[PDB]
Amino acid sequence: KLKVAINGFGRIGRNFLRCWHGRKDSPLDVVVVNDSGGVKSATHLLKYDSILGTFKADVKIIDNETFSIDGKPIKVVSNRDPLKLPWAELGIDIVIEGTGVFVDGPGAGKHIQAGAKKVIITAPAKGSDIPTYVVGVNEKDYGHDVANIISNASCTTNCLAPFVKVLDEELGIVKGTMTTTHSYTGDQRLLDASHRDLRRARAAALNIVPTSTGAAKAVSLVLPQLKGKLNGIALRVPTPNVSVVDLVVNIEKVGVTAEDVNNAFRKAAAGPLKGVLDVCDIPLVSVDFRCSDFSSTIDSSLTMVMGGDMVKVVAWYDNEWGYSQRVVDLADLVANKWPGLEGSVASGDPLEDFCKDNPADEECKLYE
Amino acid sequence: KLKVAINGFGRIGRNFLRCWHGRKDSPLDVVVVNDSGGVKSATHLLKYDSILGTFKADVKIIDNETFSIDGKPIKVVSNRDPLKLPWAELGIDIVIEGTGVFVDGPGAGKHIQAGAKKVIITAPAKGSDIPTYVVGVNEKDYGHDVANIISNASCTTNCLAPFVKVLDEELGIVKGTMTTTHSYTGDQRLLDASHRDLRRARAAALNIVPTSTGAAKAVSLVLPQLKGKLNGIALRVPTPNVSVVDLVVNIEKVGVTAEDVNNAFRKAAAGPLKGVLDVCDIPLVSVDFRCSDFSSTIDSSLTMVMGGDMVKVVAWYDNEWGYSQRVVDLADLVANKWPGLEGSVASGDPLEDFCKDNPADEECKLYE
Amino acid sequence: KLKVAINGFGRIGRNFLRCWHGRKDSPLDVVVVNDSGGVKSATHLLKYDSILGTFKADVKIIDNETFSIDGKPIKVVSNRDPLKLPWAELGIDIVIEGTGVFVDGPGAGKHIQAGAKKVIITAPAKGSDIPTYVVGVNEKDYGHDVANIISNASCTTNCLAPFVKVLDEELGIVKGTMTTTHSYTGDQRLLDASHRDLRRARAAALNIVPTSTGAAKAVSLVLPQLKGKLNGIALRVPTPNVSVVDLVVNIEKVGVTAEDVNNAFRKAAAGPLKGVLDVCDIPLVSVDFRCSDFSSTIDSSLTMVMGGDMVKVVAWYDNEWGYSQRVVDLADLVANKWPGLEGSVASGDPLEDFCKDNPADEECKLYE
Amino acid sequence: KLKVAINGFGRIGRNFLRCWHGRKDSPLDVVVINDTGGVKQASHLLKYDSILGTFDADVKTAGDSAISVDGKVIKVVSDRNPVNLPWGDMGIDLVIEGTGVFVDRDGAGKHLQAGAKKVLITAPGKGDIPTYVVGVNEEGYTHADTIISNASCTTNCLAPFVKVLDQKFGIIKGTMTTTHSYTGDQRLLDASHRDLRRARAACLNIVPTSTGAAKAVALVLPNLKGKLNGIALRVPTPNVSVVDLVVQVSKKTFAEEVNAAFRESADNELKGILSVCDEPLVSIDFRCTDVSSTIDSSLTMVMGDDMVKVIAWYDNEWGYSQRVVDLADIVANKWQX
Amino acid sequence: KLKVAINGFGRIGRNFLRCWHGRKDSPLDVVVINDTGGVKQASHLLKYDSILGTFDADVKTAGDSAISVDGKVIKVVSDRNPVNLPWGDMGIDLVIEGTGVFVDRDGAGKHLQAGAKKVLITAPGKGDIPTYVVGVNEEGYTHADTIISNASCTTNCLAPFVKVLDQKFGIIKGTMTTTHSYTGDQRLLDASHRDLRRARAACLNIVPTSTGAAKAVALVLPNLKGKLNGIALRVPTPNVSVVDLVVQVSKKTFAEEVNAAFRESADNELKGILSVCDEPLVSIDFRCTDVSSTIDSSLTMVMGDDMVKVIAWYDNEWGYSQRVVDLADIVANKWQX
Numbered sequence A, B, C: 001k002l003k004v005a006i007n008g009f010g011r012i013g014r015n016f017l018r019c020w021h022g023r024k025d026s027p028l029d030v031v032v033v034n035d036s037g038g039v040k041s042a043t044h045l046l047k048y049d050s051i052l053g054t055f056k057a058d059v060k061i062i063d064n065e066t067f068s069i070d071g072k073p074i075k076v077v078s079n080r081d082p083l084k085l086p087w088a089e090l091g092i093d094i095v096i097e098g099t100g101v102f103v104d105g106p107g108a109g110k111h112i113q114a115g116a117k118k119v120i121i122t123a124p125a126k127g128s129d130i131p132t133y134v135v136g137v138n139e140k141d142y143g144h145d146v147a148n149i150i151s152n153a154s155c156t157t158n159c160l161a162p163f164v165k166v167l168d169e170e171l172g173i174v175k176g177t178m179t180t181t182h183s184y185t186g187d188q189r190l191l192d193a194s195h196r197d198l199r200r201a202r203a204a205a206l207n208i209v210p211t212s213t214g215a216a217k218a219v220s221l222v223l224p225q226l227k228g229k230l231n232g233i234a235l236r237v238p239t240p241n242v243s244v245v246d247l248v249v250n251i252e253k254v255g256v257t258a259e260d261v262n263n264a265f266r267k268a269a270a271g272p273l274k275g276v277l278d279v280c281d282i283p284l285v286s287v288d289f290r291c292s293d294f295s296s297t298i299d300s301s302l303t304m305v306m307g308g309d310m311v312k313v314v315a316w317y318d319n320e321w322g323y324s325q326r327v328v329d330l331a332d333l334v335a336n337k338w339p340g341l342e343g344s345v346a347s348g349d350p351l352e353d354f355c356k357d358n359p360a361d362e363e364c365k366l367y368e
Numbered sequence D, E: 001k002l003k004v005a006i007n008g009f010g011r012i013g014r015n016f017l018r019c020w021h022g023r024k025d026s027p028l029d030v031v032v033i034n035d036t037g038g039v040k041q042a043s044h045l046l047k048y049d050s051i052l053g054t055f056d057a058d059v060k061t062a063g064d065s066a067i068s069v070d071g072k073v074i075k076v077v078s079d080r081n082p083v084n085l086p087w088g089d090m091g092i093d094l095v096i097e098g099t100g101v102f103v104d105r106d107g108a109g110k111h112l113q114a115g116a117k118k119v120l121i122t123a124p125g126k127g128d129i130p131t132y133v134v135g136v137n138e139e140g141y142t143h144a145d146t147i148i149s150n151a152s153c154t155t156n157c158l159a160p161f162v163k164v165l166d167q168k169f170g171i172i173k174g175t176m177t178t179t180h181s182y183t184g185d186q187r188l189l190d191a192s193h194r195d196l197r198r199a200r201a202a203c204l205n206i207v208p209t210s211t212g213a214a215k216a217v218a219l220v221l222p223n224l225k226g227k228l229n230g231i232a233l234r235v236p237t238p239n240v241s242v243v244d245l246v247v248q249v250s251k252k253t254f255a256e257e258v259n260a261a262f263r264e265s266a267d268n269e270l271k272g273i274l275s276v277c278d279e280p281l282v283s284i285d286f287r288c289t290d291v292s293s294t295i296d297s298s299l300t301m302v303m304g305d306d307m308v309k310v311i312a313w314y315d316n317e318w319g320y321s322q323r324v325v326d327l328a329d330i331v332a333n334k335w336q337x
């Protein structure tokens, strides 16, 4: 519905589309993606995935720039600049960062300058200005007139968030850390070629990535209670796409079994996060978690306590699905809300809207 | 000298300025503000305070937007939109917030994407990820290239944290409450009118405006060591400009008297909070603290202890002046931590500036 | 100097042999290989390695049976039953268990019965009596000819040894939890096919597996000082030989930094864990610790002090070759104090010391 | 109705299963397997694949030996000895040498002896084997034949079209070679084995060898014998593999002529069997594509119009059992007994 | 003693570097590199390698540009503009790019006028490119000719003996292809690029392609053109790669006859150039191996004494560099100017 596009074109964008496409009831009007490669390169790549393979649809490349999916006619712009991006030229409000380089509101602003209204980030953008977002966790915090330039944190983050939020607030962490099975990712130099660092340079095909991420800190970025108490690097490892994590942490709870947590997870799974995340009990391995509809998928067995405090919690995810699954929902929560606002009718806050418009109202300013 | 910035000419603005201009050798200054004030007014608006009175230097009104501060040529603009802020368009580095409406990094990154690096609000924003900052409290804790835009919480808090961040640290509070005065500020209503709020809507001119504030908790928002350990009351009293906080605290320090803590504060004033916290000796009242560059202003005699455990501590603080004196210096740590201070950091060992320039291809910092 | 077989071609023993041949003056008289494949198959891998590649020198394949490693005549055999191992015939001294199966005492002991003297396996303790044995930690304890049935547990285990002795002894841990980058293990199968259980039942070739491992128990079975206090899970990963563990631990000593522990490591690397423990300080990647010499190696950086008491710390180790060194180490560790003594120089008028041979004497009638 | 059974429930099993299940309208009454693999394990095997992913199909091990695939129970026990393997329990229609170890003629019969009628070895049989497969000998197959085999997926892949190519063009001589995956055929890690190569870990290497495909052509192709042979390369893949072929041929032409020839070949024979295109896509992009093999029509460059390098893909796993499933129903067809 | 500079510190850089140090009595005053790569970063990239492990030596970029290795400093800067590169600062003798973008003649010049004299690039350049490789065209090197490049390893691999084959037996026609390792030519994942395959992820797949080799054969050879051509496969290797070839040769023979020819050819001219063995081996078994490749004579089967499948590894990286050093040496030696 609302004109959607994708700044740049990351792997995510492909599957994201492949989701947005699979995606059934899109209130999102995807019409173009900033793929610096034309209709060809934008049709071929996205058509066949390293995992999802050739898509189950049509990649018709219209006008050497456009491209339709069995009837989803969609342009493909091609420019490494934000300012020459048909957002105003195509009413694009919701957009998608694909470059990963535009962790700046400016670039998004440049998109806003190009007539964008809303963009996401395929990372925790280092502009701290925009509060990140993640479904099942802080998506509810998303309202209107808050960060038109929009942000979300990393899949890694965007995976652990809910339950690590949930389990603590159900159990209570004082601090603790985590790693994961993060994958070999093009952000790393697949073979040993300089990247200002050695890590991503080293041949990911044969090594883990010794490197600190932001997940261990972007955690509290949606859950304040987690302020600083999390650290310790996740691990990018030779996986195609799999991304599974476990975090051990202390406790402030009584030190229940490693069972009545997956219970709480089952609860968290059932109640607040049905479909949002998941939890399993069959001992499964990397690839099986595939196109998983859950930012979080968790075993009950590997959970383990020793003295009440220390609690390792298995978890899995896929960047793509997860990040997609989030943005699968994000723009909707944007769409269903910001376009077609249709605010309330309670005079108690009628002016507060005009204050939400102009907080320097004749009388709105509060607590200085 | 750095291209510092200030959102609008808020009633804190000129204070900052007149104190910044009163300041001897700040490496920091703005050359342009933005508000529909008219410089000639704005000058007068700056020039002859209702409290500090006429400045001791004439700012030439070069024109309706520009001017020269007694030979310091500085501009203003007139707009309410943070987008079209000529910030890079005047090379702006880091901004100060004046409206108070921007509890959001969202409104901030605007200024960033207007061409700024970071921003500060003279207010406790609602951006958790934004840490407020206050001398002797979180300066070294502050790190540049972390949480780009920040703010400072209430001058109250800005005054609060100083002593407590030693008080409990030497004494040790069980859970004590604070109580402060408050001079009528524009957010309130001088002659009873209609803010959505009831409290800050009556004729503050006469009646005490007793109002709550996250201040008694926003302290924890940078002093979690006392998280939840305090909640109090602010008291908006008919004063032109003046404020004082009397916080009682149950102390695990048996019934230690006060003067000793005040001597520790005498120490602390002679210590961490040089120029910030003052411990006084003279019967002194609202004006009798006017324009002191101290934030925390305390009289040991006027302090005392009820039951050894619980002990109250009177602490004075201007609203406007002190804030400035603090925030003006608080701004410095950002220049003291200025990005490379624009000099002598990148002796090609990075090769990363170009990688910062050629953002994607030479995927140096392709974080993922 | 002391007779050394190969009980089935242990790839561990392979490099261990490669170690041994690469060793300087090992009293381990390597003499024969029970590789169920003949001289042909039992030299090809001894001439070309997966992670080492071709050997430096040539293990010439002398007769259809029995060969040399560069003029070092070494026999071969082809059998699977210890009782069918002509080892007394070859005066064999130490069990060189490559079959990786006879974690049992007796079948292993059968080799002693076959004429060996002391058991040695890459075996976690199937039973208990088998002394959980590693250099650096539980090596000096080894009683000369006392309890000949010994071995070493999993790589990870003997990998754990130094720090799991160090950190505690240097800090004092209440509990803790590790997890290591575990290479795929030959015993665990390549693909999704028939398997003991479900876990290794997949193609970790492209997937990944954690699982329980007695290591934590084992190293506690090594060092009771944290018996039943540590846990964690190795992480099967598509690596030929990558093996580097983390460790998260609630410690007792104040939330001191890591460098201290790393200087403690420095001192510990200086200390008895010299050569088997390294303090890693250059940022390096998995393979880089190729053919390494240290059962433990810890990057300066990833050493993390989460909550002071909670502390995260990596540790690197060549799962095989290092272990092989360790394997070479423990043998020499015994080979020195080996039964080359003065052959029972003690004297006792004890008819026990007389009937010790003629135990069948109701005169003495051994206690039993 | 084809009460077929498998022993050694190898990857092809689930493949065949997920085929059989996916191959709706099955006269194949496969209700009986056997493998050292655990009973419920066999499910997880099928229920969780590294290739097809976890099976998108309800799974249940019923009581135990029987396994309710989406409900369709199927017995399976754990054993190796044919005479132990009680095919007589359902008087099995066909045996399938999923074991990979009873390439023998006897054990096959011993399965029949222990309760079956027909045999198709999963692998190129050990000598006295009438090999039958689509394109070449599936027609030449009569149900009268009992102990038969399907040769390697590779073989299963290559045979027909290149044979048809010869039928189309006339091949003086031919040299092919697979880009085969790494498989259970080789040791995972640096283990012992008959051949040094497979004994090597090699999961990051390639195996220079030759499969019976290089010869099973003659085993199946009457004209095409001896003159048409190359080697095999088991190469660093966990998955669907490709294969080269150069052919000294008679017909003076260029690939494009043969391309359409290979195009019409799909339009006549490879329909549902083999495939060919030129959209440059990687092996993965060929996963589970039931057309058992694909050809890059372009890169089949032409040398003097006699020497003819050609490309060839193949779903070593999925299309294989598919073709075996094909012949399975072909055995269900004309099922004289 | 030859002041050669190295733009584009590509894997060959450390390779040749490690070679340069692995080589003894350097005729090469290669005291200078160039790459965007971080000085220390490069040092580690030198000091440590996914292929060879760490560099068993000294690494300490002397100041910034220079790099103290075994006392030997070596310059390097992070620049892309050829004319910016301080070729004049040392008055560079030979251009050595690794960016893989100077297929042109011009950047060479844009390197030359900046103070360089000779020019060779690893890959077969595009245009007026003087093909040069040991055994074949290296002899053509005089000092007048300066702006040259090198053939590909792949190219270099087949190069001499295939001619020697055509020399020894005569080749009617021939078709080759590599098992090439994945390179910078492919973005780790399928990200936009000229060749969709080269774009394709394929870090677990193959690259159906055809390097200039399949033509550079004609380039490096006097007459061996067109008739001799195949394709290229960059395949799932991180390491030394193999290359297939079937030749349609003139002389009638059997394999070892020509493999003996290979054998007798191995010593005299292919000394350190190639090799040939029959121990059943796989990829890794030749890491850092001096010669360009070994031949599996056994698996070099023959069809009708003309069609001859052939086996060939190749140290895509190191032996290339070895050859690159060799070529460099050939240019280093007989240094007329």
Ligand SMILES: NC(=O)c1ccc[n+]([C@@H]2O[C@H](COP(=O)([O-])OP(=O)(O)OC[C@H]3O[C@@H](n4cnc5c(N)ncnc54)[C@H](O)[C@@H]3O)[C@@H](O)[C@H]2O)c1
Binding pocket: A007, A008, A009, A010, A011, A012, A013, A034, A035, A036, A079, A080, A081, A098, A099, A100, A101, A122, A123, A154, A155, A156, A185, A186, A187, A319, A320, A321, A323, A324, B360, B366, B367, B368, E191, E192
């Ligand atoms: N894919 C996910 O779900 C996910 C999850 C979290 C984070 N990330 C990380 O974020 C980044 C992007 O996500 P990705 O995985 O899709 O990676 P990616 O490498 O596919 O994304 C970068 C893409 O953007 C294109 N691009 C770069 N600059 C451009 C410009 N100026 N104009 C137009 N196109 C431009 C590149 O050509 C490339 O195709 C990566 O580093 C990735 O690791 C991805």
Ligand SMILES: NC(=O)c1ccc[n+]([C@@H]2O[C@H](COP(=O)([O-])OP(=O)(O)OC[C@H]3O[C@@H](n4cnc5c(N)ncnc54)[C@H](O)[C@@H]3O)[C@@H](O)[C@H]2O)c1
Binding pocket: A360, A367, A368, B007, B008, B009, B010, B011, B012, B013, B034, B035, B036, B079, B080, B081, B082, B097, B098, B099, B100, B101, B121, B122, B123, B154, B155, B185, B186, B187, B319, B320, B323
């Ligand atoms: N003056 C004090 O004592 C005090 C105390 C605490 C906090 N503050 C900070 O200052 C804010 C208000 O106090 P003040 O001192 O600034 O008085 P103020 O009333 O002058 O601050 C609001 C000013 O910002 C301007 N404004 C509002 N919206 C604007 C917009 N879109 N664009 C440009 N300008 C806009 C108005 O012109 C106004 O002058 C507070 O919300 C807080 O942020 C001030």
Ligand SMILES: NC(=O)c1ccc[n+]([C@@H]2O[C@H](COP(=O)([O-])OP(=O)(O)OC[C@H]3O[C@@H](n4cnc5c(N)ncnc54)[C@H](O)[C@@H]3O)[C@@H](O)[C@H]2O)c1
Binding pocket: C007, C008, C009, C010, C011, C012, C013, C014, C034, C035, C036, C079, C080, C098, C099, C100, C101, C122, C123, C153, C154, C155, C156, C185, C186, C187, C319, C320, C321, C323, D190, D191, D192
């Ligand atoms: N290599 C390590 O780092 C490590 C560490 C801890 C434990 N282990 C275990 O110990 C085993 C030895 O380690 P490895 O490095 O030598 O790998 P490995 O491949 O050598 O272990 C398997 C070997 O056991 C032999 N084997 C088993 N049953 C046999 C039988 N009836 N007859 C003859 N040989 C038989 C095989 O021939 C094979 O050589 C490993 O298989 C592994 O399970 C290994």
Ligand SMILES: NC(=O)c1ccc[n+]([C@@H]2O[C@H](COP(=O)([O-])OP(=O)(O)OC[C@H]3O[C@@H](n4cnc5c(N)ncnc54)[C@H](O)[C@@H]3O)[C@@H](O)[C@H]2O)c1
Binding pocket: C193, C194, D007, D008, D009, D010, D011, D012, D013, D034, D035, D036, D037, D079, D080, D081, D097, D098, D099, D100, D101, D122, D123, D124, D151, D152, D153, D154, D184, D185, D316, D317, D320
């Ligand atoms: N798809 C192909 O590429 C291909 C090609 C040609 C032939 N094949 C056939 O399929 C096999 C390849 O796939 P796979 O996964 O079956 O490989 P595999 O070689 O591992 O087959 C053995 C399977 O059967 C079981 N098994 C073996 N011997 C057994 C016995 N005596 N008793 C019980 N169970 C036994 C094993 O547990 C395993 O699941 C080959 O061995 C061959 O028979 C497949």
Ligand SMILES: NC(=O)c1ccc[n+]([C@@H]2O[C@H](COP(=O)([O-])OP(=O)(O)OC[C@H]3O[C@@H](n4cnc5c(N)ncnc54)[C@H](O)[C@@H]3O)[C@@H](O)[C@H]2O)c1
Binding pocket: A193, A194, E007, E008, E009, E010, E011, E012, E013, E034, E035, E036, E037, E078, E079, E080, E097, E098, E099, E100, E101, E122, E123, E124, E151, E152, E153, E154, E155, E183, E184, E185, E316, E317, E320
């Ligand atoms: N082995 C073969 O026969 C073969 C196969 C493929 C390609 N090639 C060619 O030969 C070379 C392969 O070996 P290689 O190690 O040189 O390859 P490579 O993949 O390392 O080449 C890229 C290198 O150039 C550097 N580089 C790129 N742009 C640069 C710039 N603007 N400034 C400075 N440095 C820059 C990179 O940092 C990196 O080190 C490539 O040049 C390639 O075109 C030959």
